[PDB]
Amino acid sequence: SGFRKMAFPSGKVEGCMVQVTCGTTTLNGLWLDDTVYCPRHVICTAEDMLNPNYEDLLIRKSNHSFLVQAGNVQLRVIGHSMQNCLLRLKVDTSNPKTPKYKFVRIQPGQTFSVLACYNGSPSGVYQCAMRPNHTIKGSFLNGSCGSVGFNIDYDCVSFCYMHHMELPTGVHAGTDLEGKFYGPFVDRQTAQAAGTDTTITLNVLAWLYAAVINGDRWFLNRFTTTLNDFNLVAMKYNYEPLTQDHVDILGPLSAQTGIAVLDMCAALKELLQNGMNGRTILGSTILEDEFTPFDVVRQCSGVTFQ
What, of a second copy, other proteins, none, does residue 173 touch, CB below 5 to 8 Å by kind?
A: other proteins
Q: Alpha-carbon distance 152 to 139, whole Å?
A: 21
CB 182 within 8 A of CB 104: no
Catalytic one among 16, 22, 38, 41?
41
CA neighbor of 37 nearest in space, from 168, 140, 197, 148: 148
145 binds other proteins (CB under 8 A): yes
C-beta of 138: minimal distance to a second copy in Å? 5
CB 205 within 8 A of CB 267: no
285 binds a second copy (CB under 8 A): yes
Catalytic one among 22, 44, 128, 145?
145
185 binds other proteins (CB under 8 A): yes
> Which of 98, 188, 241, 299 touches other proteins (CB under 8 A)?
188
Q: Alpha-carbon distance 105 to 8, whole Å?
A: 18
Q: Alpha-carbon distance 165 to 140, whole Å?
A: 9
258 binds a second copy (CB under 8 A): no
Q: Alpha-carbon distance 189 to 230, whole Å?
A: 41
For 242, which DSSP code? P
Closer to a second copy by Cβ: residue 172 or 269: 172
What, of a second copy, other proteins, none, does residue 41 touch, CB below 5 to 8 Å by kind?
A: other proteins
Catalytic annotation present for 145: yes
Closer to other proteins by Cβ: residue 166 or 240: 166
Helix or strand run (H / E) with residue 202: helix 201-213
For 9, which DSSP code? P
Catalytic annotation present for 41: yes
Q: Alpha-carbon distance 192 to 168, whole Å?
A: 8
Interaction site with other proteins (CB under 8 A): 39, 41, 44, 49, 140, 144-145, 147, 163-168, 172-174, 185-192
Interaction site with a second copy (CB under 8 A): 1-12, 14-15, 115-116, 122-128, 137-141, 166, 170-172, 214, 283, 285-286, 298-299, 301
